[PDB]
Short mmCIF file of N, CA and C in Angstrom, two decimals:
data_model
loop_
_atom_site.label_atom_id
_atom_site.label_comp_id
_atom_site.label_asym_id
_atom_site.label_seq_id
_atom_site.Cartn_x
_atom_site.Cartn_y
_atom_site.Cartn_z
N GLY A 1 0.86 -1.22 0.00
CA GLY A 1 0.00 0.00 0.00
C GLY A 1 0.88 1.25 0.00
N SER A 2 0.36 2.36 0.44
CA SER A 2 1.16 3.61 0.46
C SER A 2 2.46 3.40 1.27
N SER A 3 2.38 2.72 2.39
CA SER A 3 3.60 2.48 3.22
C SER A 3 4.09 1.05 3.03
N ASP A 4 5.36 0.81 3.13
CA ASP A 4 5.84 -0.58 2.93
C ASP A 4 6.62 -1.07 4.14
N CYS A 5 6.55 -2.35 4.39
CA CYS A 5 7.28 -2.91 5.56
C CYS A 5 8.05 -4.17 5.16
N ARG A 6 9.12 -4.43 5.84
CA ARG A 6 9.92 -5.64 5.55
C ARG A 6 10.00 -6.45 6.85
N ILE A 7 10.17 -7.73 6.76
CA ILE A 7 10.22 -8.54 8.00
C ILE A 7 11.60 -9.16 8.20
N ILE A 8 11.96 -9.39 9.43
CA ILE A 8 13.31 -9.95 9.71
C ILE A 8 13.20 -11.22 10.55
N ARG A 9 14.15 -12.09 10.40
CA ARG A 9 14.15 -13.36 11.14
C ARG A 9 15.58 -13.75 11.52
N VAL A 10 15.85 -13.84 12.78
CA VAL A 10 17.22 -14.21 13.21
C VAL A 10 17.16 -15.46 14.07
N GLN A 11 18.26 -16.13 14.24
CA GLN A 11 18.25 -17.38 15.05
C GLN A 11 19.51 -17.48 15.91
N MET A 12 19.42 -17.22 17.18
CA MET A 12 20.64 -17.34 18.05
C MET A 12 20.62 -18.73 18.70
N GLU A 13 21.67 -19.51 18.53
CA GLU A 13 21.68 -20.91 19.09
C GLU A 13 22.55 -21.04 20.35
N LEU A 14 22.66 -20.00 21.14
CA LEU A 14 23.52 -20.11 22.36
C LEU A 14 22.93 -19.31 23.53
N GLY A 15 23.42 -19.55 24.72
CA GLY A 15 22.90 -18.84 25.92
C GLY A 15 22.74 -19.87 27.05
N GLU A 16 22.49 -19.44 28.26
CA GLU A 16 22.28 -20.45 29.34
C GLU A 16 21.07 -21.28 28.92
N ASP A 17 20.15 -20.67 28.23
CA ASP A 17 18.96 -21.43 27.72
C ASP A 17 19.05 -21.53 26.19
N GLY A 18 19.80 -20.66 25.57
CA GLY A 18 19.96 -20.68 24.08
C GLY A 18 18.60 -20.64 23.37
N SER A 19 18.60 -20.25 22.12
CA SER A 19 17.35 -20.18 21.32
C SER A 19 17.66 -20.65 19.91
N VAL A 20 16.73 -20.57 19.02
CA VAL A 20 17.02 -21.05 17.64
C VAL A 20 16.26 -20.24 16.60
N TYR A 21 15.58 -19.21 17.01
CA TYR A 21 14.82 -18.40 16.03
C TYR A 21 14.66 -16.96 16.54
N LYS A 22 14.06 -16.13 15.74
CA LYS A 22 13.81 -14.71 16.14
C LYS A 22 13.11 -14.01 14.97
N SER A 23 11.86 -13.69 15.13
CA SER A 23 11.11 -13.03 14.02
C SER A 23 10.48 -11.72 14.50
N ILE A 24 10.74 -10.62 13.84
CA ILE A 24 10.14 -9.34 14.30
C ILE A 24 9.71 -8.51 13.10
N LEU A 25 8.69 -7.71 13.25
CA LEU A 25 8.22 -6.89 12.11
C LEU A 25 9.14 -5.67 11.91
N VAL A 26 9.56 -5.45 10.69
CA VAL A 26 10.43 -4.28 10.38
C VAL A 26 9.70 -3.35 9.43
N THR A 27 9.85 -2.07 9.60
CA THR A 27 9.22 -1.14 8.63
C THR A 27 10.29 -0.80 7.59
N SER A 28 9.95 -0.07 6.57
CA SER A 28 10.96 0.26 5.53
C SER A 28 12.16 1.02 6.13
N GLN A 29 11.95 1.80 7.15
CA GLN A 29 13.10 2.60 7.73
C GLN A 29 13.38 2.24 9.19
N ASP A 30 12.97 1.10 9.62
CA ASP A 30 13.18 0.70 11.04
C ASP A 30 14.42 -0.17 11.23
N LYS A 31 15.33 0.25 12.07
CA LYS A 31 16.53 -0.57 12.33
C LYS A 31 16.30 -1.40 13.58
N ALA A 32 15.67 -2.52 13.46
CA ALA A 32 15.41 -3.34 14.67
C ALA A 32 16.33 -4.57 14.83
N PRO A 33 17.47 -4.65 14.15
CA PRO A 33 18.36 -5.80 14.38
C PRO A 33 18.82 -5.76 15.84
N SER A 34 18.69 -4.61 16.46
CA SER A 34 19.11 -4.43 17.87
C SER A 34 18.00 -4.87 18.84
N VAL A 35 16.79 -5.05 18.36
CA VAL A 35 15.69 -5.48 19.26
C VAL A 35 16.06 -6.82 19.89
N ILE A 36 16.90 -7.56 19.24
CA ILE A 36 17.30 -8.87 19.84
C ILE A 36 17.92 -8.65 21.22
N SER A 37 18.70 -7.59 21.38
CA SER A 37 19.33 -7.31 22.72
C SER A 37 18.26 -7.10 23.79
N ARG A 38 17.23 -6.34 23.48
CA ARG A 38 16.16 -6.15 24.49
C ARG A 38 15.42 -7.47 24.65
N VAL A 39 15.39 -8.24 23.59
CA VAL A 39 14.73 -9.57 23.63
C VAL A 39 15.58 -10.49 24.48
N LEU A 40 16.87 -10.29 24.47
CA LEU A 40 17.75 -11.16 25.29
C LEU A 40 17.27 -11.20 26.74
N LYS A 41 17.35 -10.12 27.46
CA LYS A 41 16.91 -10.16 28.88
C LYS A 41 15.44 -10.57 28.98
N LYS A 42 14.61 -10.04 28.13
CA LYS A 42 13.18 -10.43 28.18
C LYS A 42 13.04 -11.91 27.80
N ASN A 43 13.86 -12.40 26.90
CA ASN A 43 13.75 -13.84 26.49
C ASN A 43 14.97 -14.63 26.98
N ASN A 44 15.63 -14.14 28.00
CA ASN A 44 16.82 -14.86 28.54
C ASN A 44 16.40 -16.01 29.45
N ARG A 45 15.12 -16.17 29.66
CA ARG A 45 14.64 -17.31 30.51
C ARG A 45 14.23 -18.50 29.64
N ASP A 46 13.87 -18.27 28.41
CA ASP A 46 13.46 -19.40 27.52
C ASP A 46 14.37 -19.49 26.30
N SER A 47 14.70 -18.37 25.73
CA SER A 47 15.56 -18.36 24.52
C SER A 47 17.02 -18.10 24.88
N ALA A 48 17.67 -17.20 24.19
CA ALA A 48 19.11 -16.94 24.48
C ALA A 48 19.27 -15.89 25.58
N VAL A 49 20.45 -15.76 26.12
CA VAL A 49 20.66 -14.76 27.21
C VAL A 49 21.80 -13.80 26.90
N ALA A 50 22.81 -14.28 26.25
CA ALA A 50 23.96 -13.41 25.93
C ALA A 50 23.96 -13.05 24.45
N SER A 51 23.72 -11.81 24.12
CA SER A 51 23.71 -11.42 22.68
C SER A 51 25.13 -11.16 22.18
N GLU A 52 26.11 -11.47 22.97
CA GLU A 52 27.51 -11.27 22.51
C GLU A 52 27.78 -12.32 21.44
N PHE A 53 27.26 -12.10 20.27
CA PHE A 53 27.41 -13.10 19.18
C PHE A 53 27.74 -12.47 17.81
N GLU A 54 27.93 -13.31 16.83
CA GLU A 54 28.20 -12.86 15.45
C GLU A 54 26.96 -13.21 14.62
N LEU A 55 26.36 -12.26 13.98
CA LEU A 55 25.13 -12.54 13.20
C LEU A 55 25.42 -12.59 11.69
N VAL A 56 24.82 -13.52 10.99
CA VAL A 56 25.05 -13.62 9.53
C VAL A 56 23.72 -13.55 8.81
N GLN A 57 23.58 -12.64 7.90
CA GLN A 57 22.29 -12.49 7.20
C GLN A 57 22.30 -13.19 5.84
N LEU A 58 21.13 -13.62 5.43
CA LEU A 58 20.92 -14.31 4.11
C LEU A 58 21.16 -15.82 4.23
N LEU A 59 20.22 -16.58 3.73
CA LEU A 59 20.34 -18.06 3.78
C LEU A 59 21.60 -18.53 3.04
N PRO A 60 21.87 -17.96 1.88
CA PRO A 60 23.08 -18.36 1.11
C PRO A 60 24.34 -17.90 1.85
N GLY A 61 24.21 -16.93 2.72
CA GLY A 61 25.39 -16.41 3.47
C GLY A 61 26.09 -15.36 2.60
N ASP A 62 25.78 -14.11 2.82
CA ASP A 62 26.39 -13.03 2.00
C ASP A 62 26.56 -11.77 2.84
N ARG A 63 25.54 -11.40 3.55
CA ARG A 63 25.61 -10.18 4.39
C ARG A 63 25.70 -10.56 5.86
N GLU A 64 26.52 -9.89 6.62
CA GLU A 64 26.60 -10.23 8.06
C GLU A 64 25.98 -9.09 8.87
N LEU A 65 25.12 -9.40 9.81
CA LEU A 65 24.48 -8.32 10.61
C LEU A 65 24.92 -8.40 12.07
N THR A 66 26.20 -8.35 12.28
CA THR A 66 26.73 -8.42 13.67
C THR A 66 26.61 -7.03 14.32
N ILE A 67 26.98 -6.90 15.58
CA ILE A 67 26.82 -5.57 16.25
C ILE A 67 27.82 -4.47 15.78
N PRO A 68 28.94 -4.81 15.16
CA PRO A 68 29.87 -3.75 14.67
C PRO A 68 29.17 -2.82 13.67
N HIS A 69 28.08 -3.24 13.12
CA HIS A 69 27.35 -2.39 12.14
C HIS A 69 26.61 -1.25 12.86
N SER A 70 26.24 -0.22 12.15
CA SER A 70 25.54 0.93 12.80
C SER A 70 24.02 0.74 12.84
N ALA A 71 23.34 1.64 13.50
CA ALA A 71 21.86 1.54 13.62
C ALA A 71 21.19 1.46 12.25
N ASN A 72 21.50 2.36 11.36
CA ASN A 72 20.87 2.31 10.01
C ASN A 72 21.36 1.06 9.27
N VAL A 73 21.01 -0.10 9.76
CA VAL A 73 21.51 -1.37 9.12
C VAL A 73 20.47 -1.99 8.17
N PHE A 74 19.23 -2.08 8.57
CA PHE A 74 18.21 -2.69 7.67
C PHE A 74 17.95 -1.81 6.47
N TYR A 75 17.99 -0.53 6.63
CA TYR A 75 17.80 0.33 5.43
C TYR A 75 18.74 -0.19 4.35
N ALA A 76 19.79 -0.82 4.78
CA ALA A 76 20.76 -1.40 3.82
C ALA A 76 20.71 -2.95 3.87
N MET A 77 20.31 -3.54 4.99
CA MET A 77 20.24 -5.05 5.08
C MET A 77 18.84 -5.56 4.75
N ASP A 78 17.86 -4.73 4.93
CA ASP A 78 16.47 -5.20 4.70
C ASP A 78 15.99 -5.00 3.27
N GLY A 79 16.85 -4.90 2.30
CA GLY A 79 16.32 -4.74 0.92
C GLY A 79 15.29 -5.87 0.69
N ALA A 80 15.71 -7.11 0.79
CA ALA A 80 14.76 -8.25 0.61
C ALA A 80 14.25 -8.70 1.99
N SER A 81 13.98 -9.96 2.19
CA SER A 81 13.56 -10.40 3.54
C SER A 81 14.82 -10.43 4.40
N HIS A 82 14.71 -10.40 5.70
CA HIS A 82 15.97 -10.40 6.49
C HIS A 82 16.06 -11.68 7.32
N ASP A 83 16.97 -12.54 6.98
CA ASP A 83 17.13 -13.79 7.77
C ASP A 83 18.54 -13.80 8.35
N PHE A 84 18.69 -14.08 9.61
CA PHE A 84 20.06 -14.13 10.17
C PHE A 84 20.16 -15.26 11.18
N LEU A 85 21.35 -15.62 11.50
CA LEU A 85 21.56 -16.66 12.54
C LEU A 85 22.65 -16.14 13.48
N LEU A 86 22.43 -16.21 14.77
CA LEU A 86 23.44 -15.64 15.71
C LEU A 86 24.23 -16.70 16.47
N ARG A 87 25.52 -16.48 16.54
CA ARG A 87 26.44 -17.40 17.27
C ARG A 87 27.10 -16.65 18.44
N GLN A 88 26.70 -16.92 19.65
CA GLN A 88 27.32 -16.18 20.80
C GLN A 88 28.77 -16.59 21.00
N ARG A 89 29.65 -15.64 20.86
CA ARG A 89 31.07 -15.92 21.07
C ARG A 89 31.26 -16.13 22.57
N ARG A 90 30.51 -15.39 23.36
CA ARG A 90 30.62 -15.53 24.84
C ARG A 90 29.22 -15.56 25.47
#
């Protein structure tokens, strides 16, 4: 319609409880790859707890969405759908 939105999906497989998925609604200009950090403490009882990880975007493996990137990341990472998998280094 007049406004457009893109969706993102990440999967962190580590933590005291560890997790394996992560799906959140993204708007055309919303940088929510960082919502996982707020999700960590909120989901640190069932899913993952430590977001100190390396994130890789795209099923084929091409773009990486780790924390070294800046806030305006999806404006550049969310062109298509956003799929990532997170590996906690610590």
